């Protein structure tokens, strides 16, 4: 399951970067 | 899916990432 | 090839992220 | 590949705009 295990791990990464996407909106946002 | 399933979910928080990157954006550009 | 096809669509959104990602960077930077 | 590679490249675009996502959190935060 080589492929599943890759696009699991990018699926982990953009999760990431989504929940990082609205900390800065709302830093952004505060300032 | 399995993979295919996985693949979908990937694209759909790549579109939500991308919305909020145009949100930012323009926050940033307002201010 | 429709896994390849989404693989494909997912790369070019991200392509699309980065670019934007660095737009933010540089008006961030800017003010 | 040819898909392995495809999610290979997506994997490594993540990471980097994730890379950006964190620079530009820190921007924000600073100013």
């Given at each position: ?10 699926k ?8 990082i ?11």
């Open positions: 399951g080589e492929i599943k295990a890759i696009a699991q791990e990018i982990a990464i953009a999760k990431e970067i989504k929940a996407a609205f900390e800065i909106k709302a830093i952004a946002q505060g300032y």
